Amino acid sequence: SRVAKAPVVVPAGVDVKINGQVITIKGKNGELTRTLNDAVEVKHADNTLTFGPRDGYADGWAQAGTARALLNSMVIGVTEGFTKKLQLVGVGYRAAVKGNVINLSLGFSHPVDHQLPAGITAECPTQTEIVLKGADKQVIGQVAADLRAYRRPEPYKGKGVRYADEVVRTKEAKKK
Amino acid sequence: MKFVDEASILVVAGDGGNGCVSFRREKYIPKGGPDGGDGGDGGDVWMEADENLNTLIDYRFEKSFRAERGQNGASRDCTGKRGKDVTIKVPVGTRVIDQGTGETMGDMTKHGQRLLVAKGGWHGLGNTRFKSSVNRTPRQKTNGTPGDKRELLLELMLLADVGMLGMPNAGKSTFIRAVSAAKPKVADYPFTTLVPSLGVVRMDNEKSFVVADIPGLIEGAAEGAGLGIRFLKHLERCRVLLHLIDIDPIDGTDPVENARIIISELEKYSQDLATKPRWLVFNKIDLLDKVEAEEKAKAIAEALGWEDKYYLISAASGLGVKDLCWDVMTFIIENPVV
Amino acid sequence: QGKALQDFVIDKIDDLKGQDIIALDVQGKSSITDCMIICTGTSSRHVMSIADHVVQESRAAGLLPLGVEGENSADWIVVDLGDVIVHVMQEESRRLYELEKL
Amino acid sequence: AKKVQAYVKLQVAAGMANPSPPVGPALGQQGVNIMEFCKAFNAKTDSIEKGLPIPVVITVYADRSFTFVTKTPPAAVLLKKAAGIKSGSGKPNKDKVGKISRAQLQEIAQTKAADMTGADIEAMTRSIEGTARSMGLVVED
RNA sequence: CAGCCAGGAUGUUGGCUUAGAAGCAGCCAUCAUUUAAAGAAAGCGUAAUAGCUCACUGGUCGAGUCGGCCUGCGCGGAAGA
């Protein structure tokens, strides 16, 4: 509703190609392309974007605000990029980067080699830190979740892979 | 490293099954033999030792449990299956009390034994068992006797041959910073502790020196920062008992002249339980002078009225504890349980 | 190779207070074992440590032990290296069995 | 009065010589010595009188010593030796235990050197009674 | 209105038949100044100094927004060879 009516501004140098319901946000930091359910029409106004629904379907404003929201992620990702930082807590937890293969030592019987997607670049500033960089918030979120899902932080000591912004709660249960 | 607790649970012994009265047609047969067998004997709650745990919250989370009633006898002379005996796992060192005969059925010391606290009832008798010609019609029913109503009161006493009690920040929690592996949150500020800490000492070939800790108090029924009074419960089962004395506090209580009160809280509870052996071993000598120390030790030991051999080591730095280890170990080998 | 491992095992056991060491030679008497070394253990804890010690030097020496017996009971326990077999026994428990009759 | 570094205050009175049973060595343990009570703590207290507990702030950043400034004593320790009862209520509100008057405790509250809430004088004369009347006292306004 | 940026205080660590309580199972009146607003009181919760948030006030976008009831037609309750 009011999110859809809120205009989003794109910086200079980012070309927007409209071919019906497929929209490209190619710019300084890569190429992104998504498709809609065809329930939102985009209008090529002045240097901003506006959205609106059409008659016949009850959803209307509900999905209309989404197209404004998703395009917000893409415009920043091609001019500023999304950065996700993850840290390893615990003894014997190691992370390394070789090419496009991410190597992890989480106390298993074998090192784990995780394959990154096409548009994600990962680096290790230190031995217990992982930083994720990409152009789409969709891919970076799943990869960050995928690394977290391997050794999800157990509440008691927090040993595992955790988000930097996420806080883990330490509680005293099962006394003695 | 978590808060101690104890409680009691409500357990009802399984009652016996009831006799069955049944009559049956067969194809074109009006009258047949009596049908219906016995019932089911009540369950038997058992107490298994727990060495691989120390928790007691499983008694507040679940307080009421019923052993399954012995299923009633069925037709075709089918007897009632015995109610499965539920085994209640209990940590070691839990003396049990009953409402009524408040005497313990047995103390839990070893691991891997089962103790019966409530026997099951007796199965009922069906009409088939009552077949006779005096009545010529077996139809009376005999109900099963209910199981014994036993109510359990549980208190936990930790099993350790040696226990630590002493003045605040005097090294009772610092004593585990010795060759022992346990590391409780110990420092040099008031009372240093809320939870008892246990530690082991490996010496030679099955000889063990498990160490117990309790947080003491001041002048008996008093406290500094809300520390509880009922922490003597985990003690009172140590065959060898050691005591620490605060030495040269920055601002604390005076020397052994205050330890005349220390005699009291041992016998304060009921009687100190037949005056278990007590050795006055000191601590925190590393920050003092040994040449200055013999005149205090000669005065601290004798001013109270104790003339036995006193041990003078510095447990804060974890040096000199070995001679205690050998000598205490010598006590068990030279004085077993009898 | 038997003499080399015989020296390798007799030295390691003596490093951790292994008393009453006797090296037997059953060559010809029996067709299963090449050399027989016997040991004495005071009680359960350290004899298990001796079994723990010898099995982990064996893994570090290349030769893989092909069988052990002592489980939840330290009255007897064996560690095998092929030609040489070590028998670490309790002193009180040995007297029930034979000594130098194998 | 700026930020973290955990300002703390623990005292029971200034008359005695830092007893442990009431407070203990908890007067500072992150770089504050316990023997500094007779060099700078007893620098201006001994010059006037020792009969009132006084709060203290630490204010230690990286130095061996401390750089605080002393301030006024609390408003509740003044009801023991200069106004009336020395023990307290006893029964909290079953009756009227103590008694206070406007003529009492008028110049004592003015002895504070610098601890003000505004420049008004008559505004603070009824602020000192906040401690009173909370324990079952009577007002004689 | 909800977001975002700030405040969130003074007696006051409130005394009290308080074995410690500085907001918390007890204890009471539930008052009292400074200010644009702040409660002897909203909580996750340490033996407590504690860490942080909230009840309310200010600013920011600006025209609707806040939370209760009645009611037709819809969902769950509705597992057996």
Residue carrying the six token digits 């980012």: A14
Q: Give the tokens for residue B28.
A: 């074109």
Approach to solving: cryo-EM
Closest alpha carbon to D105 in D86, D136, D131 = D131
Angle, helices C44-60/C2-15, rounded to nearest 10 degrees = 140
Topology alike, domains A8-76 and A82-163: yes
At residue B184, the 3 state secondary structure works out as: coil
Any contact of B with C, at least 3 CB pairs below 8 A? yes
Distance CA A50, CA B83 (A): 72
Of the CA atoms within 13 Å of residue D137, those in its CB half-sphere come to: 19
Give yes or no for a contact between B215 and B193, defined as CB atoms under 8 angstroms apart: yes
Of the CA atoms within 13 Å of residue A137, those in its CB half-sphere come to: 10
Beta bridge pairs of residue A85: A131
State which H helix or E strand residue B47 sits in: strand B45-50
Distance CA B241, CA C74 (A): 32
Any idea what DSSP says for residue B297?
H
Residues of chain C neighbouring B205 (CB-CB closer than 8 A): 42-46
Residues of chain B neighbouring D8 (CB-CB closer than 8 A): none
Pairing of strands B10-12, B94-98: unpaired
D7 touches strand E (CB under 7 A): yes
Distance CA A77, CA C80 (A): 65
Name which of B111, B200, B204, B205 to mutate to probe chain C: the one with the most chain C Cβ atoms within 10 A of its Cβ: B205
> Between vectors from CA C28 to CA C25 and to CA C33, what angle results, nearest 5°?
60
C75 touches chain B (CB under 8 A): no
Q: What DSSP letter does each residue of A139-162 carry, written as one string?
A: HHHHHHHHHHHHS---TTT--EEE
CATH number of B162-334: 3.40.50.300
Nearest residue (CA) to C1' of E32: D130
Beta bridge pairs of residue A132: A84, A122
Burial grade of B128 (CB within 10 A; 0-12, 13-18, 19 or more): buried
Distance CA B293, CA B299 (A): 10
At residue A45, the 3 state secondary structure works out as: coil
The whole-angstrom distance between A174's CA and the closest CA on chain B is 6
Angstrom distance, A55 CA to E75 C1': 28
Question: Is B284 known to sit in a ligand binding site?
Answer: yes
Closest alpha carbon to D108 in D133, D90, D132, D88 = D132
Q: What DSSP letter does each residue of B279-295 carry, written as one string?
A: EEB----TTS-HHHHHH
CB contact under 8 A, B56 and A176: yes
Q: What DSSP letter does each residue of chain D carry, written as one string?
A: --SSS------S-SSSS--TTTT-S-S--SS--SGGGGTTTTTTHHHH---S--------SSSSS------PPPSSGGGSSSSS-SS--SSSSSS------SSSSSSSGGG-SS--SSS-STTTTTTGGGTTTSSS-----
Region of residue B226 (phi > 0: left; psi between -120 and 50: alpha; otherwise: beta) = left
The letter for the amino acid at B264 is S
E strand segments, A19-165: 22-24, 33-35, 41-43, 50-52, 82-89, 93-98, 101-106, 112-115, 120-123, 129-134, 160-163
Q: Secondary structure of D24-62 in the HEC alphabet?
A: CCCCCCCCCCCHHHHCCCCCCHHHHCCCCCCCCCCCCCC
The letter for the amino acid at B328 is V
Largest separation between any pair of C-alpha atoms in chain D: 53
Question: Is B283 known to sit in a ligand binding site?
Answer: yes
D27 touches strand E (CB under 7 A): no
Angle, helices B259-268/B290-304, rounded to nearest 10 degrees = 50
Burial grade of D122 (CB within 10 A; 0-12, 13-18, 19 or more): exposed
Residues of chain D neighbouring B250 (CB-CB closer than 8 A): 20, 25, 34-35
Reply yes or no on domain D7-71 having CATH 3.30.1550.10.
yes
Distance CA B179, CA B204 (A): 13
Distance CA A106, CA B322 (A): 40
Pairing of strands C84-90, C35-41: parallel
The residues, any chain, with a CB within 8 Å of residue B335's CB and separated by 6 or more, are none
At residue C54, the 3 state secondary structure works out as: helix
Closest alpha carbon to A13 in A83, A80, A82, A70 = A80
Distance CA A109, CA D12 (A): 60
Distance CA B225, CA B169 (A): 13
Beta bridge pairs of residue C78: C87
> Between vectors from CA B31 to CA B30 and to CA B32, what angle results, nearest 5°?
125
Residue carrying the six token digits 């190609």: A17
Angstrom distance, D40 CA to E33 C1': 33
Beta bridge pairs of residue A112: A104
Closest alpha carbon to A7 in A43, A50, A64 = A50
D59 touches strand E (CB under 7 A): no
Pairing of strands A82-89, A50-52: unpaired
The domain ranges of chain A are 8-76, 82-163
Of the CA atoms within 13 Å of residue B20, those in its CB half-sphere come to: 23
B223 touches strand E (CB under 7 A): yes
List all chains that touch chain C, counting a touch as 3 or more CB pairs closer than 8 Å: B
The domain ranges of chain D are 7-71, 72-140
CB contact under 8 A, D20 and B250: yes
**B280 alpha-carbon distance from chain centroid:** 27
Distance CA A90, CA B279 (A): 42
Burial grade of C76 (CB within 10 A; 0-12, 13-18, 19 or more): middle
Angstrom distance, D119 CA to E9 C1': 17
Question: Is B314 known to sit in a ligand binding site?
Answer: yes
CATH topology classification for D72-140: Arc Repressor Mutant, subunit A (1.10.10)
Nucleotide nearest to B225 (CA to C1'): E20
Closest alpha carbon to D7 in D38, D40, D25, D30 = D30
Closest alpha carbon to B251 in D27, C37, A80, A79 = D27
- Architecture category of domain A82-163 in CATH: Alpha-Beta Complex (3.90)
Q: Give per-residue burial for B308-338: e unless 16+ CB within 10 Å, then b.
A: eebbbbbbbbbeebeebbeebbebbeeeeee
What B96-105 contacts at long range (C-beta under 8 Å, 24+ apart), as own/partner pairs, is: B96/B47, B96/B152, B96/B153, B96/B154, B97/B152, B97/B153, B97/B154, B97/B155, B98/B150, B98/B151, B98/B152, B98/B153, B99/B151, B99/B153, B100/B151
Burial grade of B88 (CB within 10 A; 0-12, 13-18, 19 or more): middle
Q: Resolution (in Å) of the shown entry?
A: 3.7
* Integer angstrom CA distances of residue A147 from A109, A116, A132, A161: 17, 10, 11, 7
Closest alpha carbon to B13 in B85, B114, B119, B115 = B119
- Residue B100 CB neighbour total at 10 angstroms: 9
What C23-31 contacts at long range (C-beta under 8 Å, 24+ apart), as own/partner pairs, is: C24/C100, C24/C102, C26/C102, C29/C102, C30/C102
B250 touches chain D (CB under 8 A): yes
CATH topology classification for A8-76: Outer Surface Protein A; domain 3 (3.90.930)
Angstrom distance, D96 CA to E29 C1': 12
Give yes or no for a contact between C53 and C85, defined as CB atoms under 8 angstroms apart: no
B51 touches chain A (CB under 8 A): no
The residues, any chain, with a CB within 8 Å of residue A139's CB and separated by 6 or more, are A117, A119, A120
State which H helix or E strand residue B273 sits in: helix B272-275
**B31 alpha-carbon distance from chain centroid:** 61
The letter for the amino acid at C81 is L
Any idea what DSSP says for residue C84?
E
The whole-angstrom distance between B219's CA and the closest CA on chain A is 29
The dihedral through the CA atoms of D40, D45, D50, D55 has a sign that is: negative
Angle, helices A137-150/A61-79, rounded to nearest 10 degrees = 80
Distance CA B106, CA B96 (A): 8
Distance CA B284, CA B245 (A): 10
The letter for the amino acid at B187 is A
* Integer angstrom CA distances of residue B282 from B244, B246, B301, D100: 5, 8, 10, 53
Give yes or no for a contact between A85 and A164, defined as CB atoms under 8 angstroms apart: yes
Give yes or no for a contact between D96 and D77, defined as CB atoms under 8 angstroms apart: no
Nucleotide nearest to D72 (CA to C1'): E11
Distance CA B80, CA B122 (A): 12
Distance CA A26, CA A85 (A): 25
Closest alpha carbon to B16 in B147, B148, B150 = B147
> Phi/psi at A132 (nearest 5 deg)?
-110, 135
State which H helix or E strand residue C77 sits in: strand C76-80
Distance CA B208, CA D5 (A): 46
Q: Give the tokens for residue C68.
A: 């052990």
The residues, any chain, with a CB within 8 Å of residue A112's CB and separated by 6 or more, are A103, A104, A105, A106, A150
Closest alpha carbon to B11 in B40, B44, B52, B33 = B44
